[PDB]
Ligand binder design. Structure first.
Ligand code: CDL
Ligand code: HEO
Ligand code: UQ8
Ligand code: 3PE
Ligand code: 3PE
Ligand code: LHG
Ligand code: LHG
Ligand code: LHG
Ligand code: LHG
Ligand code: LHG
Ligand code: HEM
Ligand code: CU
Ligand code: ZN
Lengths: 98, 184, 658, 262
């Protein structure tokens, strides 16, 4: 259970972390690497902001099993996505006419 | 039993997160399978996506307002905030349907290429989740109006809170990975 | 108005399939007529079909599993006969169009509707009792999950008489399973059966996970739970984390087949290698989901029938957790030969053979549980010992396949068939039979016949070895899986030995059927009066046999591992409580069966492209869901008088016994 | 069980010989621990049966640091050795890795069809169905693709299989240590004609015999000089007899692959 103040804080932070990436990509603010790093980092930070301010994620709810489940799910997603990308990159490279 | 249900719904949402992750991996694998058709840069209109993002974020904040009203035991404010959230989500869905219709009528639908298939799968799965959330929200609004803020309805409001905020989090991931990275 | 559905879908021309359809229809009519004659329709509907009691649902799961085991084994027998005939230089009786259906359906049935429902039903029956809970966290969800499983069973069986089943292998690799090369309805039967059953499987995973986390009796910390509960928890974690993968992968295949999308097609930017990657990312966690619960069963049985504490409890629990985590980082060993290169293959082979260490730790912990015990050779213990031997061999061959260099020449060979049948039968099937024998008195209140149980065990183990060791040899001789026609004659001797082994397994199944019949016939002489027939150690043996529909009149309080054994050692077992209190219980609901029926209609309509009927079915599912959401009376209180009466009868039994 | 004269336990190719050695090594390493497990199961069952009143009974003995340490460490050592061998051999037996050999490799292009194997000898300008020849003790470079669906090109007595995917090229290197006729199959089920997807790999005693085979193929009245002829050959068929084609279109393998990469 949050409050109005934390909800508005998350709202403003989400607005900033959403506007900046869109402006950076639209206007070509910096180099492609800088733009990519900025948008990815801000996306991760905004996800954290939503998890804290809006979902009230904490290490005590449900005897800590709420946080445990979230962290385990993030690890499983990392395994699945990174492994799939790595496997498919290697497979596609080995599928070429070389 | 409310806490048990809310925790169980959180676990279900973890499973839904893995579902979306598989869709994201498929999109990453197939993003360049454009098959001589449009790429992301040729169809992603960033101002449109920004308006959609703001609609979904406003809906998340309004649901937070509804939850706050629920903890203040104010039925009318709960219903009003839920209605505003429903309108914002409906606007997001309408914009998404308009985008998909525009792509389809111009021979740019999922059957055109692997990239378009993956884009439709990911974005439309998110949209289907939003539509389910909207049907759920409408049912819950009617139930709250019929019987007020019972313990049953409070647990349901919390479960739908989890669902709606999670949908906006998934959308953060979606716009970052799909639209911003394709447009760049 | 009927989509593609037409009279031509019925395979009139096929005599074997037509005879089977007639036989199944006659059996269904006989069952309906017997239920009518005894007038048990109301009893069935009110006590089993709408039941939200986990014990009833577990029994129903196992009933479904055994009935589908019959069909899966009939498929296996047909395949063995066809291969024996074809290796002799004859056409046999199954042409490829039917044989390929047969092996695809055999795989799908044995995995999703025999193995999965069996372990799920065992967990349903046992876990709430072991932790001292009165029910699962979400009883109505439990009923709905069972009925979604039934939806899958119905769809796969309907594929027999209407259209045909997929001819692609049990995982439906594209582009062979795609619309271009599989234009028929078979892949759609596969798709919708799996999707509808997977919904229920995911819900079951969530239900059991929350149940174990939240509904344990006071004082039972995580490291005081019975090992079977730990295994169930890990299996449900794997279900929750992996079955969404199957949902998405099958949905993408569905989009490819129905909407002409290009996820897995040969051209237009599709990539079928992605389908193989995803399907196996689900697939390996599936085998670990199957094996973990039976590891728990074997732990319980070995401790009980050794009259000894389980050895290395903490080591066992952490090995289970390790296997759980590692089951998600090995899936590429299923397509080592697709050409991912040495780095990827080596990494995944190494992870695969790493996850073998905790399994060996488990095997040796069981061995040392038997060490310096007093081993009673109950049929359940025979299953346990046979599992140790057989599963050791099977896991050894699996570890061999984990080496990519060896897999390059053993992939898709009958060596692979032998390996996964070795592990499946030696672990999952043996453990399912062991747990069924072990908990039959708890479920029904009387013991199974031991003579026919032991005969069934001996037939099963000897027949497995005779049936599948020749397949290891055949794999070394270069015979590949899914061959049916003009099989090379030098495989003929091994194929004949395999057929004879299959016949021995058929005799084992007959022995099981006879065992059930005889046990039911003589149930009055083999009653379980005290609820503790084996001298068990966990809380499920603290109740009556069968337990009262509410499990425990008073939620027990645990102080140590093996709570019931400690209660017996301290004299605290069978103590009449000073007073009783009303018990909150969930009411039975017909909503789950209605949602499942609408889902069945929806799946059938989608298979035959009956769009209006599919819309009706989907709308029915959602509308029934909403209407149920409007229900208020979903619980009731058991009066103290009822509890007093049941507890008094149980205590009269306890006093009479001793 | 196994078979002494089996394709994998009696291989005739270098890759297959190394794979046999790898299999035997892994088998022995695993036996080191598997045999004690089975023997202990049976021996503990017998010795500590409830009947035996002489055997020691320890109902409350449930933890032993020494026993747990041994049961954890022995598998760890076995698996460390197995993992080192796995890394080394996986990198040594990589299918795309060309072999170290004095003789120049012969390139054979492989196209799986429904349901038969089509082979192109780009250097010799011939093509065949369900039969390949090459000199023994001469490395063979296989370029593998599929025309319809997943197949697996496999000559069990020579060594590794490799998947054949449409629009994709996989590479396999094999060599025959002795001349002979070796059975070839598809190891990935590809449809109703799968059972008949057999071919013969003839390892000739010397290059003269391979040249005679090439010349015999060159006198074929039929040609594969156009994609239309390939499409005619690719119409579904089963249990295809051996056929030879002369004047194969150059870059035919590339054209087959490009059919799916538009
Ligand atoms: C506290 C709440 C808050 C926690 C959350 C906050 C922290 C967040 C961090 C995440 C949480 C971590 C887990 C903490 C559990 C908390 C609960 C708790 O501790 O109390 C319950 C419980 C208390 O229950 P109890 O009722 O009081 O009874 C306990 C008895 O006293 C016991 O009596 P016993 O006689 O039966 O003792 C049994 C003893 C076994 O009996 C022995 O003493 C013989 C020892 C055998 C040595 C051989 C080791 C085998 C492992 C090989 C590893 C090779 C090197 C790995 C290199 C990497 C691979 C390249 O222990 C074992 O079973 C060993 C199993 C180890 C296998 C793990 C897999 C190996 C990879 C991890 C390497 C580190 C392992 C450390 C080894 C510790 C040895 C004690 O605590 C215990 O379980 C006892 C201690 C054993 C803990 C095992 C630790 C597991 C290690 C996993 C780390 C993974 C690395 C990180 C990766 C994560 C992302 C992938
Ligand atoms: C529930 C069933 C189940 C179980 C439990 C296992 C367990 C294991 N499996 Fe199996 N498998 C199962 C069922 C399947 N497997 C497959 C495919 C498959 C493949 C792919 C091969 C290919 O496609 O060519 C590999 C490499 C393995 C390896 C392993 C390993 C290393 C284990 C390890 O978990 C086993 C560890 C256990 C051991 C080793 C025995 C006990 C240990 C001892 C005695 C002491 C310690 C010993 C050592 C350290 C060596 N499996 C397929 C696919 C079939 C299809 O394609 O249709 C199926 C269905
Ligand atoms: C390809 O088909 C093959 C298999 O699958 C691969 C097999 O299973 C088999 C082996 C079959 C065996 C004998 C296994 C027997 C094991 C049995 C008893 C367990 C089976 C479980 C069941 C009771 C089914 C449970 C699910 C059901 C209740 C769902 C109902 C599905 C039904 C019966 C199929 C629908 C059939 C239709 C109604 C046909 C349409 C009727 C027509 C209009 C006219 C019919 C005319 C005739 C002549 C009566 C063969 C023969 C085969 O070749
Ligand atoms: C496809 C992907 C989507 C699949 C459906 C996933 C949505 C359902 C998630 C379930 C969340 C479980 C969280 C636990 C919880 O909150 O408990 C609520 C309730 C179970 O609690 P219980 O005590 O048993 O009963 C109360 C209601 N009478 O739980 C419930 O009663 C609600 C869940 C039961 C309704 C399930 C409906 C099945 C979905 C049908 C759509 C199928 C899609 C067709 C594909 C084409
Ligand atoms: C590659 C990807 C492929 C897969 C695609 C997946 C697409 C589907 C994704 C969306 C899944 C939707 C998940 C819906 C979550 C709702 C779960 C739920 O019921 O919440 C539990 C909550 C607990 O409260 P309780 O008192 O116990 O009531 C239980 C129900 N009787 O109970 C309640 O609060 C009451 C809920 C009332 C029931 C509301 C149901 C609305 C959702 C219907 C879903 C179908 C929508 C169709 C979409 C349009 C299709 C064109
Ligand atoms: C679970 C997987 C999720 C993936 C979803 C994406 C796949 C669906 C793609 C559309 C099918 C292909 C086109 C066939 C149709 C086709 O080719 O016909 C072309 C047709 C245009 O012609 P009309 O039908 O308007 O013409 C008719 C007149 O001439 C006479 O009345 O396009 C459409 O109307 C479809 C636009 C629907 C767009 C909205 C649906 C988007 C998906 C759902 C998103 C979620 C939110 C929905 C909430 C309600
Ligand atoms: C796969 C398709 C399944 C059919 C779905 C449609 C269901 C139709 C029945 C619903 C209306 C019932 C109205 C109740 C009306 C009512 O109150 O009386 C129902 C009545 C219950 O009375 P009893 O049989 O208990 O006898 C009464 C005496 O005991 C005196 O009290 O039963 C019947 O006469 C038959 C009804 C069920 C017939 C079964 C349907 C066929 C099912 C086939 C499934 C295969 C077999 C497997 C079973 C495990
Ligand atoms: C995938 C699932 C497929 C079905 C599996 C096979 C089971 C079939 C049912 C067995 C026969 C039940 C006999 C009732 C026995 C009987 O007498 O009923 C018992 C019950 C109560 O009647 P009584 O007269 O005993 O009144 C007692 C009162 O005190 C109220 O509790 O009646 C009902 O409430 C209706 C139940 C029947 C209707 C349920 C089936 C309908 C749903 C399934 C079909 C789908 C419909 C949608 C399609 C568009
Ligand atoms: C070689 C491979 C290496 C494997 C290492 C894996 C390490 C595993 C560590 C898990 C983190 C434990 C932290 C819990 C911290 C927490 O909040 O729980 C606290 C909990 C304490 O519970 P109790 O208060 O009942 O007391 C139990 C004892 O600690 C008292 O002595 O800690 C445990 O004992 C848990 C033991 C691990 C059991 C793991 C269960 C499975 C984990 C996955 C759950 C999420 C599923 C989501 C579904 C998508
Ligand atoms: C166009 C053709 C339409 C035919 C539809 C067939 C409807 C038949 C309903 C049979 C229900 C059997 C009752 C068993 C009785 C039983 O035990 O189940 C009762 C169960 C839940 O009822 P309650 O919430 O009152 O709980 C009663 C007990 O379960 C107490 O726990 O089901 C319902 O009442 C849901 C009703 C669904 C109604 C579905 C509406 C039809 C959907 C199709 C519409 C399509 C429109 C398209 C628009 C795009
Ligand atoms: C009861 C004894 C059983 C026998 C005699 C048996 C026999 C076989 C046979 C003959 C095949 C085809 C092998 C080949 O391709 O040549 C096979 C495939 C298979 N079996 Fe079994 N089986 C049995 C039990 C089981 C069980 C319990 C499971 C799993 C739970 C299972 C799962 C499979 C799977 C997944 C396949 C692969 C199907 C595929 O081709 O797609 N079997 N079975
Ligand atoms: Cu695996
Ligand atoms: Zn490929």
């Amino acid at each position: 259970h949050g409050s109005v103040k934390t909800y508005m804080t998350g709202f403003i932070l989400s607005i900033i972390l959403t506007v900046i990436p869109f402006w950076m990509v639209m206007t070509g603010a910096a180099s492609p690497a800088v733009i990519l790093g900025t948008i990815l980092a801000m996306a991760v930070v905004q996800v954290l902001v939503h998890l804290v301010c809006f979902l009230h994620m904490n290490t005590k709810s449900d005897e800590g099993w709420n946080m445990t489940a979230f962290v385990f799910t993030v690890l499983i997603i990392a395994i699945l996505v990174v492994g799939s990308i790595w496997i498919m990159w290697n497979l596609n490279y080995n599928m070429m006419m070389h | 039993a409310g806490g048990t249900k809310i925790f169980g719904f959180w676990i279900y949402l973890m499973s839904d997160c893995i579902l979306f992750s598989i869709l994201f991996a498929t999109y990453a694998v197939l993003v360049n399978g454009t098959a001589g058709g449009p790429t992301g840069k040729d169809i992603f209109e960033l101002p449109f996506v920004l308006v959609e993002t703001f609609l979904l974020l406003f809906s998340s904040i309004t649901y937070g307002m509804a939850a706050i009203a629920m903890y203040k035991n104010n039925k009318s404010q709960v219903i009003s905030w839920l209605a505003l959230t429903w309108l914002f989500g409906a606007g997001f869905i309408g914009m998404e349907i308009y985008e998909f219709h525009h792509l389809i009528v111009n021979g740019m639908g999922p059957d055109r290429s692997g990239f378009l298939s993956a884009f439709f799968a990911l974005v439309g799965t998110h949209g289907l989740h939003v539509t389910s959330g909207l049907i759920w929200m409408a049912v819950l609004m009617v139930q709250i109006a019929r019987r007020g803020l019972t313990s049953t309805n409070r647990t349901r409001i919390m479960c739908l809170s989890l669902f709606w905020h999670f949908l906006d989090v998934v959308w953060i991931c979606v716009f970052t990975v799909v639209y911003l990275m394709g447009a760049m | 108005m009927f989509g593609k559905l037409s009279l031509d879908a019925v395979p009139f021309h096929e005599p074997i399939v037509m005879v089977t359809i007639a036989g199944i229809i006659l059996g269904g009519l006989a069952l309906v007529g017997l239920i009518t004659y005894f007038g048990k329709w109301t009893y069935l509907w009110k006590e089993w079909l709408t039941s939200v009691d986990h014990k009833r649902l577990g029994i129903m799961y196992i009933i479904v599993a055994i009935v589908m085991l019959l069909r899966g084994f009939a498929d296996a027998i047909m395949m063995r006969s066809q291969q024996a005939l074809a290796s002799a230089g004859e056409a046999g009786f199954l042409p490829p169009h039917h044989y390929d259906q047969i092996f695809t359906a055999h795989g799908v049935i044995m995995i999703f509707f025999v193995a999965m429902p069996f372990v799920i039903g065992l967990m349903n029956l046992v876990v709430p009792l072991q932790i001292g809970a009165r029910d699962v966290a979400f009883p109505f969800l439990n009923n709905l999950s069972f009925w979604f499983t039934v939806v899958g069973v119905i769809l796969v069986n309907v594929s027999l008489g209407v259209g045909e089943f997929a001819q692609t292998g049990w995982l439906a690799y594209p582009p062979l399973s795609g619309i271009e090369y599989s234009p028929g309805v078979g892949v759609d039967y596969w798709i919708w059966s799996l999707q509808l059953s997977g919904i229920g499987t995911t819900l079951t995973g969530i239900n059991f996970f929350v149940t174990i986390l939240k509904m344990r009796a006071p004082g039972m910390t995580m490291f005081k739970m019975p090992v079977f509960t730990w295994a169930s928890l890990c299996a449900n974690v794997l279900i929750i984390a992996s079955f969404p993968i199957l949902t998405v992968t099958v949905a993408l295949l569905t989009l490819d087949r129905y909407l002409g999308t290009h996820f897995f097609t040969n051209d237009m930017g599709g990539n079928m290698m992605m389908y193989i990657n995803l399907i196996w990312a689900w697939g390996h966690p599936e085998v670990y989901i199957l094996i973990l619960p039976v590891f728990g069963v074997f732990s319980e049985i070995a401790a009980t029938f050794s009259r000894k504490r389980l050895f290395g409890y903490t080591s066992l629990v952490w090995a289970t957790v390790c296997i759980t985590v590692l089951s998600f980082i090995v899936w590429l060993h299923h397509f080592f030969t697709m050409g991912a290169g040495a780095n990827v293959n080596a990494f995944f082979g190494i992870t695969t053979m790493i996850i073998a260490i905790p399994t060996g730790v488990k095997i040796f912990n069981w061995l040392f549980t038997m060490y310096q015990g007093r081993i009673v050779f109950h049929s359940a213990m025979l299953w346990t010992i046979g599992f140790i031997v057989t599963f050791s061999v099977g896991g050894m061959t699996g570890v061999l396949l984990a080496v990519p260099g060896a897999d390059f020449v053993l992939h898709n060979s009958l060596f692979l068939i032998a390996h996964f049948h070795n592990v499946i039968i030696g672990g999952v099937v043996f453990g399912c039979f062991a747990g069924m024998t072990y908990w039959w008195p708890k479920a029904f209140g009387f013991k199974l016949n031991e003579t026919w149980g032991k005969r069934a065990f001996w037939f099963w183990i000897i027949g497995f070895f005779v049936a599948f060791m020749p397949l290891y040899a055949l794999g070394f001789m270069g015979m590949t899986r899914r061959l049916s026609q003009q099989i090379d004659p030098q495989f003929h001797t091994m194929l004949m030995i395999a057929a004879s082994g299959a016949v021995l397994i058929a005799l084992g199944i007959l022995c099981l059927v006879i065992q059930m019949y005889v046990s039911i016939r003589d149930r009055d002489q083999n009653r379980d009066l005290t609820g503790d027939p084996w001298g068990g150690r966990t809380l499920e043996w603290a109740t009556s046999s069968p337990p009262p529909f509410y499990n425990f009149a008073v939620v027990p309080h645990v102080h140590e591992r093996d709570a019931f054994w400690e209660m017996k050692e301290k004299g605290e077992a069978y103590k009449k409580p000073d007073h009783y209190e009303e018990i909150h219980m969930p009411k039975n609901s017909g909503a789950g069966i209605v949602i499942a029926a609408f889902s069945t209609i929806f799946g059938f309509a989608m298979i035959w492209h009956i769009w209006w009927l599919a819309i009706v079915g989907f709308a029915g599912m959602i509308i029934t869901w909403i209407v149920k959401s409007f229900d208020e009376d979903v619980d009731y209180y058991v009066p103290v008088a009822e509890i007093e009466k049941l507890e008094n009868q149980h205590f009269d039994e306890i006093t009479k016994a001793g | 069980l196994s078979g002494c004269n089996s394709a994998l336990l009696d291989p005739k190719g270098q890759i297959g010989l190394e794979q046999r050695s790898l299999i035997l090594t892994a088998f022995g390493l695993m036996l080191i621990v598997v045999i004690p497990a089975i023997l202990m199961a049976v021996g503990f069952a017998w010795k500590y049966r409830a009947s035996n009143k002489d055997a020691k009974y320890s109902p409350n003995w449930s933890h032993s640091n020494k026993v747990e340490a041994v049961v954890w460490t022995v598998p760890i050592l076995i698996i460390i050795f197995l993992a080192v061998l796995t890394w080394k051999t996986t990198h040594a037996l990589e299918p795309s890795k060309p072999l170290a050999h004095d003789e120049k490799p012969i390139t054979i292009e492989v196209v799986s069809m429904d349901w038969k194997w089509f082979f192109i000898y780009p250097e010799q300008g011939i093509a065949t169905v369900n039969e390949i020849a090459f000199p023994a003790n001469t490395p063979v470079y296989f370029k593998v693709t599929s025309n319809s669906v997943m197949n697996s090109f496999f000559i069990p007595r020579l060594g590794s299989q490799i998947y054949a995917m449409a629009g994709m090229q996989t590479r396999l290197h094999l060599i025959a240590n002795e001349p002979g006729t070796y059975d070839g199959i598809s190891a990935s089920y590809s449809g109703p004609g799968f059972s008949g997807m057999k071919f013969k790999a003839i390892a000739t005693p010397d290059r003269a015999a391979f040249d005679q085979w090439v010349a015999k193929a060159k006198q074929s009245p039929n040609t594969m000089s156009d994609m239309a002829a390939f499409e005619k050959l690719a119409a579904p068929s089963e249990y295809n007899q051996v056929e030879y084609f002369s004047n194969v279109k150059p870059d035919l393998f590339a054209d087959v692959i490009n059919k799916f990469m538009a």
